[PDB]
Symmetry: C4
Subunit: 388 residues, 4 copies
Amino acid sequence: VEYRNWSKPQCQITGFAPFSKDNSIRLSAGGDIWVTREPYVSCDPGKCYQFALGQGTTLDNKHSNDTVHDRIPHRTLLMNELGVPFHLGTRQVCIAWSSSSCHDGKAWLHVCITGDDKNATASFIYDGRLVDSIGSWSQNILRTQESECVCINGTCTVVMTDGSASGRADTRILFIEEGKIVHISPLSGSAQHIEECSCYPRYPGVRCICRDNWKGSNRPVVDINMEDYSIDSSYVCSGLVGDTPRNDDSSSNSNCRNPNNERGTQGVKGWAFDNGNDLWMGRTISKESRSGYETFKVIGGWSTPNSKSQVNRQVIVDNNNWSGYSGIFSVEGKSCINRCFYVELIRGRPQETRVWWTSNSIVVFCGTSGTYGTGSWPDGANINFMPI
Amino acid sequence: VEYRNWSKPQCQITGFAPFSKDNSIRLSAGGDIWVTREPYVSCDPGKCYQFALGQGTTLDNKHSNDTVHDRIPHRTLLMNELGVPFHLGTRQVCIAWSSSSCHDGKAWLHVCITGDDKNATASFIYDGRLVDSIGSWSQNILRTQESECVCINGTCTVVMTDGSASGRADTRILFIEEGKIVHISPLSGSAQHIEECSCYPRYPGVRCICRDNWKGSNRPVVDINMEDYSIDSSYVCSGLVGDTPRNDDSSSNSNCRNPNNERGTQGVKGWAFDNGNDLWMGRTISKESRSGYETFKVIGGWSTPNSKSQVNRQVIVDNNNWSGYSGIFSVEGKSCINRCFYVELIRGRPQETRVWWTSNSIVVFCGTSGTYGTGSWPDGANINFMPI
Amino acid sequence: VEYRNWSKPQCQITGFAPFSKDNSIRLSAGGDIWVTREPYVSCDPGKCYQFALGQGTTLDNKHSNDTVHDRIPHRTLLMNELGVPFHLGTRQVCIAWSSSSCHDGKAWLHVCITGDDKNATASFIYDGRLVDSIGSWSQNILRTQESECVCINGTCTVVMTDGSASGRADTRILFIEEGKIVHISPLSGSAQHIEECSCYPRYPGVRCICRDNWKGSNRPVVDINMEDYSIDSSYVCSGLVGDTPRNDDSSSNSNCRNPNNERGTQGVKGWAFDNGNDLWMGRTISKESRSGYETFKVIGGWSTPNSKSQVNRQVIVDNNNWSGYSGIFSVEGKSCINRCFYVELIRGRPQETRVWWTSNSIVVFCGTSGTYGTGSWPDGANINFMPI
Amino acid sequence: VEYRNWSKPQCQITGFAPFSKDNSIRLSAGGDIWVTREPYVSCDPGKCYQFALGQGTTLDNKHSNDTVHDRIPHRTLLMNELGVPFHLGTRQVCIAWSSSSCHDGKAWLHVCITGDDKNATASFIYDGRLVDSIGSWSQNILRTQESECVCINGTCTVVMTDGSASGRADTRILFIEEGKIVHISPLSGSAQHIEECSCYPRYPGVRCICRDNWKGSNRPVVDINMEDYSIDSSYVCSGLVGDTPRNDDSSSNSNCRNPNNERGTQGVKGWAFDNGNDLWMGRTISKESRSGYETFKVIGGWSTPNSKSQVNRQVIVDNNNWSGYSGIFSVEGKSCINRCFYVELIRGRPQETRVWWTSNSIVVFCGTSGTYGTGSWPDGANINFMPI
Ligand SMILES: *[C@@H]1O[C@H](CO)[C@@H](O[C@@H]2O[C@H](CO)[C@@H](O[C@@H]3O[C@H](CO[C@H]4O[C@H](CO)[C@@H](O)[C@H](O)[C@@H]4O)[C@@H](O)[C@H](O[C@H]4O[C@H](CO)[C@@H](O)[C@H](O)[C@@H]4O)[C@@H]3O)[C@H](O)[C@H]2NC(C)=O)[C@H](O)[C@H]1NC(C)=O
Ligand SMILES: *[C@@H]1O[C@H](CO)[C@@H](O[C@@H]2O[C@H](CO)[C@@H](O[C@@H]3O[C@H](CO[C@H]4O[C@H](CO)[C@@H](O)[C@H](O)[C@@H]4O)[C@@H](O)[C@H](O[C@H]4O[C@H](CO)[C@@H](O)[C@H](O)[C@@H]4O)[C@@H]3O)[C@H](O)[C@H]2NC(C)=O)[C@H](O)[C@H]1NC(C)=O
Ligand SMILES: *[C@@H]1O[C@H](CO)[C@@H](O[C@@H]2O[C@H](CO)[C@@H](O[C@@H]3O[C@H](CO[C@H]4O[C@H](CO)[C@@H](O)[C@H](O)[C@@H]4O)[C@@H](O)[C@H](O[C@H]4O[C@H](CO)[C@@H](O)[C@H](O)[C@@H]4O)[C@@H]3O)[C@H](O)[C@H]2NC(C)=O)[C@H](O)[C@H]1NC(C)=O
Ligand SMILES: *[C@@H]1O[C@H](CO)[C@@H](O[C@@H]2O[C@H](CO)[C@@H](O[C@@H]3O[C@H](CO[C@H]4O[C@H](CO)[C@@H](O)[C@H](O)[C@@H]4O)[C@@H](O)[C@H](O[C@H]4O[C@H](CO)[C@@H](O)[C@H](O)[C@@H]4O)[C@@H]3O)[C@H](O)[C@H]2NC(C)=O)[C@H](O)[C@H]1NC(C)=O
Ligand SMILES: *[C@@H]1O[C@H](CO)[C@@H](O[C@@H]2O[C@H](CO)[C@@H](O)[C@H](O)[C@H]2NC(C)=O)[C@H](O)[C@H]1NC(C)=O
Ligand SMILES: *[C@@H]1O[C@H](CO)[C@@H](O[C@@H]2O[C@H](CO)[C@@H](O)[C@H](O)[C@H]2NC(C)=O)[C@H](O)[C@H]1NC(C)=O
Ligand SMILES: *[C@@H]1O[C@H](CO)[C@@H](O[C@@H]2O[C@H](CO)[C@@H](O)[C@H](O)[C@H]2NC(C)=O)[C@H](O)[C@H]1NC(C)=O
Ligand SMILES: *[C@@H]1O[C@H](CO)[C@@H](O[C@@H]2O[C@H](CO)[C@@H](O)[C@H](O)[C@H]2NC(C)=O)[C@H](O)[C@H]1NC(C)=O
Ligand SMILES: [Ca+2]
Ligand SMILES: [Ca+2]
Ligand SMILES: [Ca+2]
Ligand SMILES: [Ca+2]
């Protein structure tokens, strides 16, 4: 087996087509299903897998109570084939309250973070064995992508942050060969806060669209040079911004370089990708809540500051339904590299207080060069039907 | 591994022998089992799989309530090895309220349709990745076979319809190579309405026996030329007709060319296949309801208009028990291609109102050149024992 | 992969050592587990599988009620790796209320019988597809081994009976190549009634120890010549007889040739095998009930009429616990062919009337040339703890 | 595939990083999960497996009552991929109330002991078949490691004891080739009592750190010469001793040669390993009870009698939480052999009497040459949330 190089052009797409849905919460009302959050998707050269952070319990289980909390020692990374819900036969790949995973063409890498807030440990597991680890560098919740890392020619990269969630922090970009950390580069450029990067191969390098939790409702960009380990960063140009919270479309701004200081504090994991001067992006439909999900293309959204002409919009989840995190993954076709995305569909607390748990299902779409229609694919569980 | 060509003679059979049964509904009363409908069977060159459309829920689950409806966003295509019931470890292959799947000798193709009635999307997934998609062309429930598609030398064909369920509609035949649509041919010939085709390889081409939902209780035939993409169509000659509803045997007719205008509106998915001048076919035992299931050979049933001499009848499901859709699949043997069929056994609403759900199990038979006896293999669940 | 020839000497053993146990009934009180009976074990060249006839339901399920009955349309053959209990992910291999399975070195053969008592059908499934079938020849419960068939050089043999359970019947020996019946030989020799054969390879032929349900408490022997399809039959010489019911050891007899007319009517499936002049055999400890299970070697038990000197006895299940059917399977080692056996542990009705179901677990032992101790490995469920 | 030789240097480590956690007990409160104890981990050359001794029942099941007992006929060895909890699809590999397993590079060996206390049987299963067996030699609970055995160049070694738990016993070291016992060496050297060895490859031989249940709270060492079958034994030098119970650190002693006669009676399975003159070891945090778990390096802990200078301590489980057995396993990396360990986390009786069962979950760490932080990873179940 050969290392992936992702050395094909990006598929020219017209939008996205339905790919997968797991119905986790509906199933949880009649079956033993893991409580999760922070899901993502990543594929080996043959097939795709769904991942999530378990909460060390199933939903219909008293331990599901107060699973709104992000960090407990019992969180583990779950991995199934895409479309297989997280049932009791699911493998817990590592201990993790924050993670990233990727396949380099030969084997899986998993980056798993657990332990004390002020002194966490990141474990690096490759091809079924622990190869490396690193401890917290800023003593304030060492944390990573919650989506797939990216490997080119046997070197995988992942973005990690340690430090304040509401002020300047310490972001580093790791380069890993067969599970071994071979280089660490500090964040460089104009991005001022980086969380939860959604990265993708853009041969010869890697590009990430992330979350600014401090001053920006525009999404930061991190560019990773795999030849020399140099880092650059900026913000997505589009005046239609991707974070939540954010200003309405008529009063939102981005200058490509600085955080916009528009409802900048807090955020949600998300994604976007460039195509020439244009930008494909997703976001919640609501400007303030993790509600709904839409995708569209922004004409000049990559190259032109404050561009706001969109086209090819698709509703993925209507605004009467809950969404959550979302992220990108890439899939190699015969001639081109395709871009796909998943959307986390969060149910329970804090928004729905009839139940005491917090969990999610997922829906997944992939880029298409063909045509498509309309729809809405929300979680679909009736909150009144659920065990509390 | 090589592409399938199905370039062997059809097996000469004497009837059918028991092959598989999943007991889905009996098991649902003591286990977490998916609610499904529209099942089918398809085999890779080594082994067979059962498929069905899930309803995004298990049976013993409040979400099973009112699952009689055909189209919701939570329907996904399920795929297990044949005989493995749809338990919680079942893979949801794609999002779909209508589907078709087939293996070309190298990899699986799945055709999955979901979304709004008036603006649906068909996704084409091959070897684990989304390769193509197409949107609705008549804005009225784009829909497909609910049984296996057929591939010859790397080109797979599938029949799809969009438009009225009770009048002229727009039927097209797609040719797909490794998930990529390479040609689309409009329906041609004398068939006037086409739904839910049951297709099979008949080298060098593909033949389908379908459902006319408009004016015929005789079943339409669609013939597909894989070399030049030409289409022809007609009706099964047999005066013993295959649809439900239909006239009594003494007053049913077919002229091989036109819908018979005998209780023609509505219908049920079904199958038949030719052997020289004769016809093997299945149908419900009841003339008006989806009750019972029988197979037989009609002497001159392929070539002689209105032929009514049957022989080699077998009861598959007695008329005191519910059936449902049925369809064909083909299995390559050492010297010949065999024909098999499945029967959907529908339980719950609208026929059985003690429970609020609608689901099914399956029974499966394959052609035999040997001998056999008699029996009846219905769903077998006691409606009074079920969770409602 | 090559066809099995079993052309090695039989392992010289000193007794048997513990190999597997599934605890099916204990687990059934806290989990969804199939209701079964008539289990057996058979191994491919790499690993062993457990088989049983399902009753189309799990135990904690209202459909488990009155599963004492031997024949319903919902019985299917289950197949898991040995030691994996029959959970809801278990594959139902075929429809069957009587079966036999075996691997020829290349693929699995399954012989599955279902349908009406007076007109049953036996299906032959090889390498995942239906290859042949045969109908009832005597119109009175066509039936077969309920343990493994045996293949030499690509030809598998299986023994089937059709006709009276309490008088002369019609027993035939089938020879099957890649699922295709190539020859059928009538029973010949002095055995007067044959049921439920436990067969094993004894290169160049196959030897079976069976059950006489009419006049013998001594077990019939069927010898199968694989070169010319000729059949011979007799009775096990040992004066310590293997069937249940039977006379006590002080008043039991066998002359090697005729049924002994000692408590001959009825019986239980069982096994024995020859080693030179000696015989290894198992049987229930009780002479009248399917209670307990013991094995031992009978000195001169193969060659000497009415021999009653035993040695190397082992208790497998003590006589305070229920047993049931038992049968042989053979496993190829580096230098020799080993003999193993399973014991069915039947719980529920008719012996235990607190519950309404009938089911079983299994325990499995293999021949050893080493040493061993003592024990008892019964089903182990507390009948008072079970769902009724 | 080739036999393992473990002919690489030991990885130089700085401590341990989180590797796996199964959350078995939390899950048992909302799912059907096996009752177990005495777990361990062992890896084939590609991936790791978790093993444990089942109690023939799930937790939420009346049969879980009084599962504190160590030996019943229904105990079987369970084997899943590491991180897959023991759900109902788990394979029971053999019948066993004491076990050891290991992979020689080609296939799995399992050593399974069951039967009467005074006359037990050890079965040896290799590559899926029973190859050998041995009976009890001292008629007093024949028993073995409860962790992985070790194979070099096709010979596997395992340590077994038979005899008193509180006085001199009969310990033997077996050498097994492809499941066949080829040599048995008696214990030799100065270790006076040996139980539950935790062994590891130390090319060209094998080294074990065990439990002295008679006179020592210092842990015995057994060294195994694989070339000539000679045995030597002693005690771990470290004055910080590894057993439980044990004296306080200020009053504990070891002289490397003899049991220390300090709270020596009883004990707990545990581990340690040498690196030059230093020692890496784990132990319960509590001196008298199986509570908490810590690891550290003892400077001079291998070579210097009574050394008590520790460094690089890590809390694995805080002392407010239950631990249990622990043991070592080795994983081959690219350049070196790494050492990992598991910790059994025992819940229920006798410590927690609200429930009537006794079971466990596990947590697993592996050696790292990188860095790490702090945490605590206990079982995590709320005893008040459990079925009793
Ligand atoms: C069946 O399904 C298809 C595929 O989903 C639908 O077609 C899509 O429809 C949407 C909505 O109309 C299109 O997305 C929109 O594109 C607009 C730009 O294109 C128009 O205007 C410019 C010039 O001004 C031209 O380039 C172009 O030719 C069009 O005339 C955007 O302006 C839209 O954004 C604005 O409206 C949306 C709400 O719709 C707001 O949320 C935004 O904030 C913004 O104000 C939007 O992006 C999409 O391009 C179409 N796709 C394709 C491939 O054609 C069909 O509509 C659907 N049919 C029905 C009846 O359901
Ligand atoms: C044990 O199992 C076997 C196999 O299933 C059964 O044999 C089958 O029996 C059925 C019913 O008799 C047969 O199917 C029937 O064939 C008839 C035609 O064949 C006869 O008549 C013509 C004369 O021209 C000859 O060609 C031929 O040789 C036969 O003499 C059809 O007329 C039947 O259809 C009519 O009756 C059925 C109800 O039975 C109605 O539903 C139809 O509408 C119609 O009126 C029917 O198709 C079948 O051919 C037999 N199979 C084989 C291979 O022999 C045994 O009967 C069964 N025994 C028992 C007691 O269970
Ligand atoms: C630890 O475990 C081992 C292995 O299981 C036990 O050893 C076995 O013990 C049984 C019972 O004694 C042995 O089986 C018996 O063999 C007898 C024949 O051998 C004896 O007598 C003849 C000469 O007469 C000699 O060949 C031989 O040397 C012996 O002296 C049979 O007579 C027995 O059958 C009779 O008794 C049984 C009940 O035990 C009745 O049920 C029968 O109907 C019959 O009347 C029996 O077959 C067996 O051979 C031993 N195995 C081995 C390998 O030695 C140990 O006993 C056990 N230790 C303890 C204390 O538990
Ligand atoms: C973030 O996480 C890291 C990694 O876990 C923690 O660093 C570890 O901290 C522990 C506790 O301090 C260290 O283990 C201890 O090492 C001591 C010896 O090392 C010091 O002293 C000698 C002087 O001769 C020097 O060799 C050496 O350089 C150090 O100066 C031992 O004495 C300790 O044992 C004693 O204390 C423990 C309780 O802590 C008792 O239980 C023992 O019985 C004994 O009395 C102990 O072994 C460990 O070495 C550190 N690891 C590394 C790699 O640096 C951070 O502390 C943590 N930070 C926070 C705030 O969480
Ligand atoms: C989830 O846990 C919370 C916190 O313990 C539970 O809320 C408490 O429930 C008790 C009843 O035992 C009340 O007396 C307290 O007043 C509650 N505290 C709070 C914060 O409201 C809650 O009941 C649990 N949920 C379930 C379904 O068990
Ligand atoms: C399935 O859903 C239907 C619709 O909600 C339920 O039927 C209703 O039950 C409510 C009481 O809860 C009544 O007020 C209505 O009269 C019913 N509506 C109809 C259409 O009959 C039904 O109870 C549900 N089934 C189950 C098992 O909960
Ligand atoms: C199993 O089925 C039997 C037969 O129906 C049940 O026995 C009957 O139960 C009813 C109660 O509904 C009694 O009125 C009848 O007298 C019973 N008949 C017999 C033969 O005793 C039995 O209850 C069922 N078992 C369970 C647990 O549901
Ligand atoms: C576990 O088993 C024990 C022993 O049978 C049960 O404890 C007994 O309960 C009975 C009543 O059913 C009392 O008569 C005895 O006093 C109890 N015996 C002891 C030793 O305390 C216990 O109830 C069982 N646990 C569960 C959950 O059923
Ligand atoms: Ca923000
Ligand atoms: Ca019709
Ligand atoms: Ca008899
Ligand atoms: Ca001790």
